[model samples]
Target: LKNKLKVRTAYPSLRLIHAVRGYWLTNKVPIKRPS
Candidate 1:
């Protein structure tokens, strides 16, 4: 059960990265560029 909880937490972190990338591109800030 503890292992399962760890996996669940890891999954959302990946999704968070995806969300950040999308928002960063959408905002189009000049400080950095997306690959």
Candidate 2:
């Protein structure tokens, strides 16, 4: 349903896309061990 909207209408949707991208784009791991 979201994909059907135009980019203008989906501006907010774009933020969602960015947030999703940021989530996967992070370098930090969920569980890191001390060195």
Candidate 3:
């Protein structure tokens, strides 16, 4: 996925790329463990 992002850097539009990247990175929610 990082490789894909790097390739997209060459494109003129980066806002979309960054937006997806941000979502991809933050999409996963952390699970809370009960002590």
Top lDDT model: 1
| Poorest lDDT segment (10 consecutive residues) of candidate 1 | 26-35
Candidate 1: regions farther than 4 A off = 1-10, 29-35
lDDT against the true structure, per candidate, is 0.75, 0.62, 0.64
Winner on lDDT (2 vs 3):
3
Residue-wise lDDT of candidate 2 within 1-35, one digit each (tens)?
Answer: 66656766667578788877666556454433221
Model 3 TM-score (2 dp): 0.38
Q: Which structure among the candidates has the greatest TM-score?
A: 1
RMSD over all Cα atoms, model 3: 8.4
Error of 2 at 2 (Å): 18
What TM-score, computed on C-alpha atoms, does each candidate reach? 0.42, 0.36, 0.38
lDDT of 1 by residue, 1-35 (tens): 59987878778587788789778876886545643
RMSD of 1: 4.3
- For model 3 the local lDDT of residue 20 reads 75
Q: Would you list the rank order by lDDT, best first?
A: 1, 3, 2
